[PDB]
DNA sequence: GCCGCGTCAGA
DNA sequence: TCTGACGCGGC
């Protein structure tokens, strides 16, 4: 089909290397010093690699169209395009074979396992320190024997010939060549047949697997030692000249030049028959040079240049963050991109953004050229460029027409979540400052403090249409992580609405009656009435019921003038009740959610734009201002401070007598200071919040109109703690240790602080600033690990059809419910039907929960329900739509082709940065790290007792010892106190030692469900305390990847207890399940692994290699000759192929439907 | 666009995008760009979405169009 | 059968 | 710094 659907990695034989090489390099010459041209047999030599110029020989004698494929007799250079040089490869002959550095230093080294001997002894033989007998002979000395030089001489004298003890790489290669796999494997298995792997046998397991893999591959074992090395093409290692008359040279070129000269010197020494010691030194130096070239510093200090920086090995380039796999493969810097400053752009629409004219012209310059050619203004590309250079007036109109309906992508430097990248329609604007909508800013998490954004333009028709369909700002309203809308007003827009909504007990025009909103607006324009004044308005409009029935609402309702003005903005089908309130920021978000759920996204977007317009206009009219007088110090603060000082003096008097201990006095002083500070803070709130005025008929307290209180009450900006500090006191200040300083600050920001008090306060701020910068890297690393673990997960089928799920109940903390069961179960389908205590079934199985449906469970008071989950999902390497249930971002069942794993990984990672104490505990839970001295669990159920030597090896009679007499106990430390009675009926998997729960024990003993419940409770408990909101399903999806490995108790056709993939076991069980009869296909027990351990264990070598540990993964894959189908989103991106998710799956399904109609 | 109107006829939000792309490619290959109508009217890709919103084109009919070409 | 010393590898 | 994994050397 002309397409390669598979990629395989295998060891390369010497014959294969010779076939790859187009030429052989004998002398290390790069370029002639006088003239910058290729050397005759140099690494840059033109004859082997190719011609520098296209269809031009190096001599230049053959320079015409008449000869294209001809080869000049004068020079080896062929006539062809210069591009051939990059793909052209060369080989260097080696006088003495060199062992590969990667296999020898594999850690575990493959050569050491194959020879079944210590790595140190092999290194000693390689260095020539020792002699190994290649041929056993009739002599007693074993073939695997290291002989000292005096011992070797004595053996030669006693036995003379009949035995061989060569040293260096040649001896190791000969030993590898003279090995019989069939003889060794059968004897090794026979040792396996007598299985004693408590200690000695465990090591032997690896050798059998390695031998079997080698036999299956058919690759020669001796191939690991290389008799010849290929040379990388010159273009990959350029020596191109630069300004200042200097040439940049790659590190690889220097290593290649050194190796070639060393090989030439070795050959000359062999030709001269020079002394053996000098030959040995030359052989060792050549081996060291080869090791340095493949990877310098692996076993020795790295060689360095005149600069002294360590040289870069070929292995170094492919690995590391600067490595080729993650640096250029995923960096992919792209053209048609712009970075500019961001402006508030308030007049702009929610879907419209402001773009500078110059940037738009540069980005669409090719499109402008095409339009000009179509117009006929310019008949040539050069003419169009010249007209564009002069910025002709007609060009601007053409640019406006071209960009009228063209989408653009805006991105930020930290893309924590998919919401960060969005698509807007650009409108030409003056100035170089980019303008974006204020509401979209919250999703971007950026502010106008000099922040910079990058704009990308989609060229393809599918990409531009696709970005508009799913990447548009209007499309994203609710957060992917949570249902709550992200488009709600954040700062001033909320404050103006809150100010207008407030009512005044006495105002001009109070008690007036207005028939319609227009009449109230005319009255406000006159200004005789007061906005805070109370009026009665008759309102008649349709209302939408939860069932969706529409009913007419009519009558006279008392409302504030501001609420009546806001009435016009509200759309039809929405009750006036939501507007009839203080309209606090929490209320505005609830109103937006209600509009989106019933009215729909478009109506909600229109309502948000109207609210944003109204808030800006009203806030300016309010003209709220912040002043020093606005903040008010408490009148009784001085008396409280004096009382606290008197209490501290009394404590000091007690300590001086020696009556009280120093530690108790310090604790008492800290408590007294904290109580005084809290009382001072409580007093300040009442005075600022409460204002007393002499209204007609007497003086009464009314809510304060102070700007600071309104801002704090509004919740748009600020908080109670900041108000307490400004009008209150700093009080206790934490030192770097965090222990509160005994002295406390009674000073406040408005009154200022003493120099000593400011110095005491300085440490805490500095410590916090240091903590904020360091934490940024950890959150990103954790998010990357989560993405790697859940990267391939996706939804491929509507229904798995499994009836197995999990039990859901309210997570009471013992002091409060904390989470309602309905909220926890909301958006989740039910695995089984629910039967009421009355015995009448309420909900059928496989029914998705809905807010209307959720009411019944509370009404029926059912505290426990069973719901389907990803862990329970039976699909192989896929998630059914039903198990995920509600997407939770579009308020609909998740559509097929959506990548749940990527979203789940990103949603947990983004919230982590805000939370501080905290991230490490979550990381430990994800890694499945086991706590030290966590506890002990006993599998057998039996009476618990002690009395077995009392030596820290105390054991108990787990066997009953009555029906059958047996002992089932293991040694445990007597250091910790026992948690069991002298006589009791011990149960299987019951805790015997108090301490932290162990994650591994629960899966094998308590089962998967108990472990899943514990993990969910811990993760939700940690996230909720900080107030962050995360859906339970997102946590569970990561857990499903955590358990893909099981131990096979019975190997009917498979291996033994060695870990195997669940997907492999199920398919193998299926193949033997009905292939002949039953065949005892398999018996397995699930196991728990760390997220990094799971990611490295992935079947695809390329995905594992890219994440990290590339050299080790490559070395393991090459011996196995693993053949890998990409089977992944990451594999496709490296090959630049469409991923098997989202649009790509849909295109394939549509193509499959198209084939049938022709068929 | 809001794509919300297009979604009533089409399902999943992915099949609709693929159908719109195929329709836009067919219209561009139809020679529709005489250059006298492109300036006065919106781009073809939006036109395909408008046709889907009207529902006149019919998603099933679009699949039949691929065989013709 | 184990204490206690060690490499590697990422931050 | 560190964590662990993996080690693998002493007894
Ligand atoms: N100010 C504002 N306008 C909105 C908002 N939502 C929609 N609109 C306007 O409604 C029109 C709807 O455009 P379509 O994409 O065709 O309809 P759709 O929203 O139902 O998909 C747009 O017209 P247009 O072609 O973009 O330009 P125009 O017709 O508005 O001038 C847009 O300006 C909003 O939140 N704020
Ligand atoms: Mg900033
Ligand atoms: Zn020539
Ligand atoms: Zn499923």
Tab-separated table of C-alpha atoms in Angstrom, chain A residues 857-1067:
chain	number	residue	atom	x	y	z
A	857	UNK	CA	-32.521	9.599	45.780
A	858	UNK	CA	-32.533	12.272	48.546
A	859	UNK	CA	-36.385	12.146	48.600
A	860	UNK	CA	-36.200	8.311	48.901
A	861	UNK	CA	-33.229	8.770	51.296
A	862	UNK	CA	-31.139	5.978	49.692
A	863	UNK	CA	-27.611	6.526	51.141
A	864	UNK	CA	-25.903	3.754	49.088
A	865	UNK	CA	-25.905	3.178	45.276
A	866	UNK	CA	-23.714	1.152	42.836
A	867	UNK	CA	-22.407	3.030	39.743
A	868	UNK	CA	-20.206	1.933	36.767
A	869	UNK	CA	-16.516	3.038	36.679
A	870	UNK	CA	-13.411	2.992	34.364
A	871	UNK	CA	-11.665	0.380	36.614
A	872	UNK	CA	-14.785	-1.843	36.202
A	873	UNK	CA	-14.716	-1.187	32.398
A	874	UNK	CA	-14.297	-4.542	30.550
A	875	UNK	CA	-13.183	-3.083	27.165
A	876	UNK	CA	-9.565	-3.969	26.208
A	877	UNK	CA	-7.216	-0.917	26.123
A	878	UNK	CA	-10.303	1.342	25.783
A	879	UNK	CA	-13.045	3.144	27.773
A	880	UNK	CA	-16.757	2.663	26.918
A	881	UNK	CA	-18.902	5.855	26.759
A	882	UNK	CA	-21.290	4.507	29.468
A	883	UNK	CA	-18.560	3.864	32.109
A	884	UNK	CA	-17.408	7.543	31.864
A	885	UNK	CA	-21.105	8.625	31.776
A	886	UNK	CA	-21.566	12.432	31.651
A	887	UNK	CA	-18.641	14.293	29.969
A	888	UNK	CA	-19.222	17.059	32.583
A	889	UNK	CA	-17.964	19.789	30.185
A	890	UNK	CA	-20.936	19.849	27.725
A	891	UNK	CA	-23.585	18.444	30.156
A	892	UNK	CA	-23.998	15.429	27.791
A	893	UNK	CA	-22.866	11.756	27.581
A	894	UNK	CA	-19.165	11.731	26.534
A	895	UNK	CA	-18.886	11.449	22.701
A	896	UNK	CA	-16.636	8.734	21.132
A	897	UNK	CA	-13.089	9.711	20.024
A	898	UNK	CA	-12.572	12.080	23.007
A	899	UNK	CA	-9.282	11.579	24.945
A	900	UNK	CA	-10.456	11.213	28.602
A	901	UNK	CA	-6.965	10.293	29.875
A	902	UNK	CA	-5.210	13.488	28.677
A	903	UNK	CA	-7.930	15.743	30.197
A	904	UNK	CA	-7.884	13.762	33.482
A	905	UNK	CA	-4.057	14.010	33.734
A	906	UNK	CA	-4.069	17.813	33.050
A	907	UNK	CA	-7.021	18.646	35.435
A	908	UNK	CA	-5.277	17.109	38.536
A	909	UNK	CA	-1.921	18.780	37.644
A	910	UNK	CA	-3.190	22.389	37.180
A	911	UNK	CA	-4.927	22.649	40.637
A	912	UNK	CA	-1.811	21.329	42.445
A	913	UNK	CA	0.229	24.568	42.069
A	914	UNK	CA	-2.357	26.693	44.000
A	915	UNK	CA	-2.372	24.161	46.904
A	916	UNK	CA	0.864	24.116	48.986
A	917	UNK	CA	0.173	22.166	52.233
A	918	UNK	CA	0.394	18.753	50.411
A	919	UNK	CA	1.611	18.065	46.834
A	920	UNK	CA	4.139	15.447	48.141
A	921	UNK	CA	1.405	13.326	49.846
A	922	UNK	CA	-0.592	13.268	46.543
A	923	UNK	CA	2.629	12.343	44.664
A	924	UNK	CA	3.287	9.448	47.110
A	925	UNK	CA	-0.329	8.215	46.650
A	926	UNK	CA	0.025	8.300	42.811
A	927	UNK	CA	3.438	6.510	42.962
A	928	UNK	CA	1.845	3.888	45.281
A	929	UNK	CA	4.872	4.293	47.621
A	930	UNK	CA	4.560	2.037	50.733
A	931	UNK	CA	4.967	3.728	54.187
A	932	UNK	CA	7.850	2.344	56.345
A	933	UNK	CA	6.615	0.111	59.238
A	934	UNK	CA	3.069	0.560	57.811
A	935	UNK	CA	1.704	-2.658	59.436
A	936	UNK	CA	1.474	-6.492	59.014
A	937	UNK	CA	-1.407	-8.484	57.375
A	938	UNK	CA	-1.818	-12.283	57.886
A	939	UNK	CA	-3.450	-14.231	54.981
A	940	UNK	CA	-4.461	-17.380	56.985
A	941	UNK	CA	-7.336	-17.055	59.526
A	942	UNK	CA	-6.275	-18.454	62.937
A	943	UNK	CA	-5.910	-17.730	66.701
A	944	UNK	CA	-3.296	-14.966	67.388
A	945	UNK	CA	-0.554	-15.723	69.998
A	946	UNK	CA	3.130	-14.923	70.834
A	947	UNK	CA	5.943	-17.105	72.255
A	948	UNK	CA	8.395	-18.121	69.476
A	949	UNK	CA	11.945	-17.437	70.863
A	950	UNK	CA	11.116	-13.814	71.918
A	951	UNK	CA	14.065	-12.648	69.725
A	952	UNK	CA	12.324	-9.923	67.627
A	953	UNK	CA	11.105	-12.866	65.454
A	954	UNK	CA	7.785	-13.269	67.353
A	955	UNK	CA	5.304	-15.495	65.436
A	956	UNK	CA	1.620	-16.532	65.950
A	957	UNK	CA	-0.374	-19.750	65.207
A	958	UNK	CA	-2.270	-18.592	62.050
A	959	UNK	CA	-3.225	-22.267	61.414
A	960	UNK	CA	-6.227	-23.244	63.629
A	961	UNK	CA	-4.171	-26.123	65.153
A	962	UNK	CA	-7.400	-28.012	66.100
A	963	UNK	CA	-8.994	-29.471	62.905
A	964	UNK	CA	-5.488	-29.564	61.338
A	965	UNK	CA	-2.129	-29.165	63.140
A	966	UNK	CA	0.140	-26.630	61.318
A	967	UNK	CA	2.115	-23.383	61.968
A	968	UNK	CA	1.584	-20.363	59.631
A	969	UNK	CA	3.535	-17.407	61.127
A	970	UNK	CA	6.418	-15.085	60.050
A	971	UNK	CA	9.049	-13.315	62.242
A	972	UNK	CA	7.991	-9.773	63.326
A	973	UNK	CA	9.756	-7.136	65.505
A	974	UNK	CA	9.009	-7.152	69.284
A	975	UNK	CA	9.985	-3.431	69.324
A	976	UNK	CA	6.411	-2.281	68.431
A	977	UNK	CA	3.558	-3.104	70.904
A	978	UNK	CA	1.221	-5.949	69.725
A	979	UNK	CA	-2.319	-4.995	68.500
A	980	UNK	CA	-3.740	-8.524	69.161
A	981	UNK	CA	-4.898	-10.341	72.363
A	982	UNK	CA	-3.086	-13.483	73.660
A	983	UNK	CA	-6.087	-15.582	72.518
A	984	UNK	CA	-8.410	-14.476	69.669
A	985	UNK	CA	-9.939	-15.723	66.365
A	986	UNK	CA	-7.597	-13.905	63.888
A	987	UNK	CA	-9.220	-13.246	60.459
A	988	UNK	CA	-7.508	-13.367	57.012
A	989	UNK	CA	-6.036	-9.982	55.959
A	990	UNK	CA	-6.585	-8.454	59.445
A	991	UNK	CA	-4.243	-5.693	60.792
A	992	UNK	CA	-1.812	-7.047	63.447
A	993	UNK	CA	0.280	-3.846	63.900
A	994	UNK	CA	-0.978	-0.235	64.342
A	995	UNK	CA	0.428	2.190	61.712
A	996	UNK	CA	-0.149	3.658	58.195
A	997	UNK	CA	-2.169	1.447	55.769
A	998	UNK	CA	-0.028	-0.244	53.043
A	999	UNK	CA	-1.355	0.214	49.446
A	1000	UNK	CA	0.050	-3.136	48.141
A	1001	UNK	CA	-1.547	-5.243	50.959
A	1002	UNK	CA	-5.111	-3.908	50.349
A	1003	UNK	CA	-5.269	-5.005	46.666
A	1004	UNK	CA	-4.254	-8.656	47.423
A	1005	UNK	CA	-6.234	-8.920	50.714
A	1006	UNK	CA	-9.077	-6.323	50.849
A	1007	UNK	CA	-9.652	-6.675	47.062
A	1008	UNK	CA	-9.704	-4.004	44.303
A	1009	UNK	CA	-12.930	-2.272	45.486
A	1010	UNK	CA	-11.659	-1.509	49.040
A	1011	UNK	CA	-8.337	-0.158	47.664
A	1012	UNK	CA	-10.153	2.017	45.082
A	1013	UNK	CA	-12.477	3.447	47.773
A	1014	UNK	CA	-9.514	4.261	50.063
A	1015	UNK	CA	-7.569	5.990	47.235
A	1016	UNK	CA	-10.613	8.065	46.161
A	1017	UNK	CA	-11.389	9.114	49.772
A	1018	UNK	CA	-7.756	10.187	50.385
A	1019	UNK	CA	-7.419	12.163	47.109
A	1020	UNK	CA	-10.816	13.918	47.449
A	1021	UNK	CA	-10.168	14.623	51.160
A	1022	UNK	CA	-6.796	16.293	50.328
A	1023	UNK	CA	-8.164	18.360	47.368
A	1024	UNK	CA	-11.391	19.564	49.123
A	1025	UNK	CA	-9.633	20.885	52.282
A	1026	UNK	CA	-7.756	23.432	50.089
A	1027	UNK	CA	-11.169	24.154	48.468
A	1028	UNK	CA	-10.058	22.969	44.994
A	1029	UNK	CA	-12.863	21.070	43.147
A	1030	UNK	CA	-12.044	17.848	41.180
A	1031	UNK	CA	-14.497	15.251	39.741
A	1032	UNK	CA	-14.088	11.740	41.291
A	1033	UNK	CA	-14.076	10.096	37.799
A	1034	UNK	CA	-10.870	11.973	36.775
A	1035	UNK	CA	-8.977	10.399	39.760
A	1036	UNK	CA	-10.368	6.881	38.975
A	1037	UNK	CA	-9.269	6.957	35.280
A	1038	UNK	CA	-5.568	7.382	36.326
A	1039	UNK	CA	-6.040	4.432	38.790
A	1040	UNK	CA	-7.179	2.121	35.916
A	1041	UNK	CA	-3.751	2.544	34.199
A	1042	UNK	CA	-2.129	1.697	37.596
A	1043	UNK	CA	-3.358	-1.956	37.394
A	1044	UNK	CA	-2.462	-3.467	33.967
A	1045	UNK	CA	-0.039	-6.121	35.362
A	1046	UNK	CA	-0.977	-9.465	37.013
A	1047	UNK	CA	0.989	-12.567	38.185
A	1048	UNK	CA	0.047	-15.811	36.338
A	1049	UNK	CA	-0.412	-18.551	39.015
A	1050	UNK	CA	-0.810	-21.258	36.306
A	1051	UNK	CA	1.182	-21.093	33.015
A	1052	UNK	CA	-0.981	-23.308	30.758
A	1053	UNK	CA	0.813	-21.915	27.665
A	1054	UNK	CA	2.343	-18.755	29.246
A	1055	UNK	CA	5.341	-18.170	31.599
A	1056	UNK	CA	5.222	-18.596	35.428
A	1057	UNK	CA	4.806	-15.899	38.174
A	1058	UNK	CA	6.783	-13.333	36.072
A	1059	UNK	CA	4.667	-10.133	35.638
A	1060	UNK	CA	2.568	-10.060	32.406
A	1061	UNK	CA	0.134	-7.535	30.815
A	1062	UNK	CA	-3.635	-8.056	31.476
A	1063	UNK	CA	-4.340	-7.452	27.739
A	1064	UNK	CA	-1.827	-10.208	26.762
A	1065	UNK	CA	-3.277	-12.653	29.375
A	1066	UNK	CA	-6.913	-12.111	28.253
A	1067	UNK	CA	-6.081	-12.591	24.509
